Symmetry: D4
Subunit: 159 residues, 8 copies
């Protein structure tokens, strides 16, 4: 019942994108928390959140942000847990700024980066699930089922 | 000594980049295998590798590729295991083609992507380590020590040649 | 009556773009099939489709996909037939990601790439027709007529 | 020994790239001609070449060009034959100007575009081969053998210098 | 009364952009013609148009096109007259493809390139006017007046 | 021998690029002046130059600049004469910053932009020549001869080292 | 009561973006002026404005423009005062052209550049405030309060 | 001799770029400190530095970083002082990743960004100088003299090797 995955995002504006990560984890019955945390506007909140993640029982953190998107990398800077990053698409640069600021992390501080937008958010949840599946047979089976349903449900011809 | 991490790359040319992932895993004492598999040139070899990864005991796959990089994504298409992708720097487009071909995976088939080049390879290994550390106390301690040393090793002031 | 060209696309989302390829082939009376095939979501479906293409009588394959667009290159990886690729334009990167993932194929596995979007889809069909025309006089004549009508129909002044 | 494939390029500078297309066709025993034709600098030469390609027996045209690359597109404008385009890498923009100028053809005038550089030239020849193989059993067998050898020749593990 | 400037565009689709060039020339009372000419769809029409431009009395040609935009450069390839190019903005790449295909012309075949879109079209007309002004005092004066009105009409504060 | 074309550049560093414009004008026998003027570093020098260009007899101004290239645009802001701009290649961004800073002029202040680098400088001179040729029969003939020679000088087949 | 910060923009079109800078300065009670000044259309107006800035008592200038955006750099070329630049997002290149034309200034003529768009405009005002705060305790306190309210007001969870 | 400007950089590798900022401040006689602080690798070190900057007497912070450059932005997150950012050129992406990671700060946390590379470092120091000059007549005169000399030092015509 206690969250094993933490979904954090730069602002309310990111919810439209990050909700796909939330929905996916719920579907796979993965206990998690969903919060707003800004690296630049709430730096101490991030430090505390990331520092204590492991102690609170979290195993994976999904972080999403737009623009310069410092959130994912800074979260990874304070936690030893795997951090997955979702570039949130934005008006001007369509998430290209977010993508580079997240994926180009220096050696030593990784952020497993997913695609820009909703699909990236969804995949961050699926990637987190695949990580948890390594030591949770029940979840692993549910993940196998989800993947199998995806493959089997793709139509053979367009409508 | 059974491998828990599989490092695959599209070619020998990618090794200069992927060797950094191999070195880091060895440093952290994580048993792994290193192979060359091309999605575009040896698709059946990739299919066989990816389909049997889980049953062979692998827990994480690190895939490196450049250009129209399809290796990580296709590997992820055949395995339920987490797949981490490393964009190998390309000559003309400096790895931008590699990056987009890897990171822009459709919803439903994830590939955790790392930085272009050596730094990415190193982080892919560190990310796989943090994944394995979730259920390996010994490795977790080793990872912690490694991270802590990195931070304490950063100089405080610049050296003027 | 048996299809000599196969139009495959990553998902239903690509139909809005790939229908232009379909329409063009029908106009030129080129027998063909139109299907949904995902390299990442239905890898085995793609392997089987591409592997058996030649045996089924297909001469050219038109493949369209958005995002990382692995479909065209992976199809070419399994078939000896000419594979033409159409980058499908997408929200964030406007098909630039799709273009690079398709056109930058390594030496040994070609994908004749067309423009991003509807025009690329239309041109993939026209390119496939020009290939088939090399050994089909009737089609070659119809293609000559289509090209001639295009050139002759361009207005001399804007409205 | 009549040519069935025509390899045209904008300049001598493009030859370093296009020679790879020439070499591959020769390897597959495909009769072809190799010429220098510039759309921007020798437009009338291009018009003559493209208009007569079909009547001269050519079946596929491989065109290489860099910068504001118009050679492939204009060639396609005058011939009904399939035209394959090879973006030659440019100094400043690393071939991005070459790529967009070639691949972004308007609906109605196709140009099958290949990768930037040598790899593109090689694939343009392989693509032309696969086109010709549709109605040439002998070439088809040769192409098949070539592809099969490429796949079997890929190493299984990396060499550590 | 005979046109001294020719405005040519790739297709009707470009009119929304190229009309700004047309409007500007009319405002400055510069005799001109406005036509649709496609380098790729009507190659012979372009060759003939460009080849005969000088003989017909044209002094400057404004050419606009989107996508690969071969029109401006190919026009310059056949005429000795100054050719000005306008990259027409397009759906996918926002005219970046058009810009590079026009501005990156090789040494020996120039195309004076203007900004992407309506402003570029307007400026192509103004640039053509500044060229004609060099040997037409009446026009030069009207151009001076237009430039003076532009500068004087800029508000001092936003509304 | 009064100059009719003015070639200005932001710095000595830009000369390697702009010398190509100077050489071409001299070749076509077009009297011109070549100076260094920076919009960002010598704005008043630019203002004086641009305001008096027309009264000094100049007919066309060729301006070269790199980086946040403002020289061509600001020159155009002060003169009614046609201003041609040459984007000088930049180190990091390979001239893309130079290109956009020059070509994206607001409606009302034109700058005819040429290719990044040497080719652009050469074309700026050729464009200025074609402008001057409109009312100079002698130059027109020289320009025609120059163009015709360029086309006839293009090789027909590639040289294989 | 006399303005200590000058907000200048390329045209009325930029107001939608630059108003955020205006609003921010008013909120922090920083006396300022808001004007339209075009480097390319009103060069002499800019020269005079920038040259006299210091004499008029201005301490910081915020300049915003789209497209080639010469305004910020040219303003900095004529004044010794700190000049902050805001790339205004535009149709075609989404402000990437504006960003490079502003940030890539040569050594010797700086322009502190902010993000593309509304956020950049807002931040230019905040940066100007932080500069003024260095020698105005009352403003410094109000700035501390504004920053504190920003941090404290960020929600803990998305709605 | 108390420092009023703080120059921080992510690594020793960034020094080649940031030394230009150090040199300019020293030239203008502006007391400053130069340190190495990484946002991604020494976050706690950055937090301590940024939080105490104001109380330690610093007035302006110049931060240089490359790649996923977070140093300037995070420093700005903890201090009310103006923070100027210098994008350090990166190998593959030539500093574009550095630039976007720095300049695209969210509304509410400003970072005045300068050009990619050395020029940016130099301008960051000049910008900090102009800020300090607002309330330092002596420095203002020195800055004025410096600017005036730069303008008068620009050559009027190019040197032909
Ligand atoms: N860049 C940040 C910073 C961070 O945590 O890195 N705080 C949030 N952002 C991003 O700022 C962007 C716009 O936020 P806004 O609508 O609150 O102004 C969002 O994409 C958010 O993720
Ligand atoms: N990238 C792929 C993968 C493939 O086959 O390569 N499967 C399909 N896609 C692309 O994913 C994009 C979005 O698909 P969606 O609306 O089903 O989430 C489409 O452009 C589709 O072509
Ligand atoms: N690229 C060309 C080619 C040329 O003349 O270069 N013919 C026209 N185009 C461009 O094709 C684009 C789309 O045209 P369309 O709406 O007729 O399909 C237009 O921007 C037009 O300028
Ligand atoms: N590029 C300039 C020039 C300048 O001052 O640098 N004058 C104004 N602009 C920009 O031109 C763009 C479009 O202006 P417009 O709507 O008046 O045509 C605006 O973003 C404006 O900032």
């Amino acid at each position: 019942s206690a969250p094993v995955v933490g979904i954090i995002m730069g602002s309310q504006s990111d919810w439209e994108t990050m909700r796909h990560a939330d929905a996916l984890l719920t579907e796979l019955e993965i206990p998690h928390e969903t919060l707003i945390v800004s690296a630049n506007r709430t730096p101490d909140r991030l430090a505390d959140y990331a520092r204590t993640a492991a102690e609170r029982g979290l195993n994976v953190i999904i972080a999403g942000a737009g623009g310069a998107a410092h959130l994912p990398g800074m979260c990874a800077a304070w936690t030893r847990l795997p951090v997955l990053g979702v570039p949130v698409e934005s008006r001007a640069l369509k998430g290209m700024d977010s993508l580079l600021s997240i994926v180009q992390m220096p050696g030593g501080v990784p952020v497993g980066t997913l695609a820009i937008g909703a699909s990236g958010a969804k995949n961050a949840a699926l990637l987190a699930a695949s990580i948890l599946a390594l030591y949770n047979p029940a979840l692993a089976a549910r993940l196998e089922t989800w993947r199998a349903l995806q493959t089997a449900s793709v139509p053979n011809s367009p409508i």
